[PDB]
Write a protein that binds this ligand. Structure first.
Ligand SMILES: *[C@@H]1O[C@H](CO)[C@@H](O)[C@H](O)[C@H]1NC(C)=O
Ligand SMILES: [Ca+2]
Ligand SMILES: [Ca+2]
Lengths: 196, 82, 83
């Protein structure tokens, strides 16, 4: 079995490990992925936090806070920032090669960041169903990547991510009326074909 | 004019409730407002506007006597016409 | 007001409302604590820690147990689920 790969294509979409594009415009802070899931120690707790990103625009600067080995290293606005160095500095590593910030954290973990929005965490063979969050469980089964925090499969992913937010008193996002044209392209058929 | 539900988080303005009291955060724009149950407006604001924000809560300087600088810019003795 | 004004300056005060015979209004289930954490551990919550290093804030909050669920305090045993 090969190394899976999340992604955050554009402002509001998510690609799971097993491979499942789905839509989730949120504005609160959300659990991209973690290990503390049911009956396990809880080693790493990668998070993601967006601001003004329910409608994609030149706005929506992300904030990423990753919690491993009792550490707190986070990044936004181009650079990375350490708030609490972790104990085992040996596995730590940062490679600012090209557009990206490649970022190792251990034998079986890695992260990538295009300095603008993309978040592509990369895992190894080690876990094989030890995680949960937005990216799902990493089991090979692709339809069980909507297993909400309350341990059931949903069908409408807008209700999925609302379970995984951190601040349980901030805003749950609104079920949008589905349509093939977003806000501007809605009733502007001309512009739709120049983008198409 | 459209009444929305609560909480609410558009445009970088989380509109939350903390400790049973309502909050409005703008950390990108450098302010945190809130209200209590009785009604007591409060405004927390960064050090970035030191000697900037002129208004009804006065400038963010060190002094406390000179913080009536009108919309013209005029040190006034009356806390009322200001 | 004088309580909070001293609190903001880096020097908090405690328990002053015990004998003052005035507590600020709050909805049912809660009354005015002093210096409660903003990250109130509620019912439908993920058990995560040492991210909320924010400063300590005044305001009314639930009893020791009695977790929050939709604007009221409710006992930890009766935590619902959602679908
Ligand atoms: C404040 O700003 C004014 C003009 O805006 C300037 O004249 C003054 O030197 C500054 N100093 C203080 C203490 O505000
Ligand atoms: Ca899966
Ligand atoms: Ca002043």
């Amino acid at each position: 079995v090969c190394d899976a790969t999340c992604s955050t294509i554009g402002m509001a979409h998510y690609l799971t490990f097993d491979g499942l594009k789905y839509l989730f415009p949120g504005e609160c802070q959300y659990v991209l992925v973690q290990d503390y899931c049911g009956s396990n120690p809880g080693t790493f707790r990668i998070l993601v936090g967006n601001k003004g990103c329910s409608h994609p625009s030149v706005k929506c600067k992300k904030r990423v806070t990753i919690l491993v080995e009792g550490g707190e290293i986070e990044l936004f606005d181009g650079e990375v920032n350490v708030k609490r160095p972790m104990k085992d500095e040996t596995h730590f590593e940062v490679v600012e090669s090209g557009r990206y910030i490649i970022l190792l954290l251990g034998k079986a973990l890695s992260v990538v960041w295009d300095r603008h929005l993309s978040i592509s965490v990369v895992l190894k063979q080690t876990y094989q169903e030890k995680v949960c969050g937005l990216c799902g469980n990493f089991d090979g089964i692709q339809n069980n990547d909507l297993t909400s925090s309350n341990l059931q499969v949903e069908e409408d992913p807008v209700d999925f991510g609302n379970s995984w937010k951190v601040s349980s008193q901030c805003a749950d996002t609104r079920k949008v009326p589905l349509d093939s044209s977003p806000a501007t392209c809605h009733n502007n058929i001309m512009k739709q074909t120049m983008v198409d | 004019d459209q009444r929305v539900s609560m909480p609410y988080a558009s445009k970088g303005l989380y509109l939350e409730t903390e400790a049973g009291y309502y909050k409005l955060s703008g950390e990108a724009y450098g302010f945190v407002a809130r209200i209590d149950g009785s009604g007591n407006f409060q405004v927390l604001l960064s050090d970035r506007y030191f000697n900037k924000t002129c208004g009804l809560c006065g400038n963010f300087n060190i002094f406390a006597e000179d913080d009536f600088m009108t919309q013209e810019g005029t040190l006034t003795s009356d806390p009322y016409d200001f | 007001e004088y309580a909070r004004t001293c609190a903001q300056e880096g020097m908090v005060l405690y328990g002053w409302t015990d004998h003052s015979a005035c507590s600020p209004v709050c909805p049912a289930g809660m009354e005015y604590r002093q210096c409660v954490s903003p990250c109130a551990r509620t019912c439908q919550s993920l058990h995560i820690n040492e991210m909320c290093q924010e400063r300590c804030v005044d305001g009314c909050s639930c009893p020791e147990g009695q977790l929050l669920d939709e604007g009221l305090c409710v006992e930890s045993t009766e935590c619902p689920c959602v679908h």
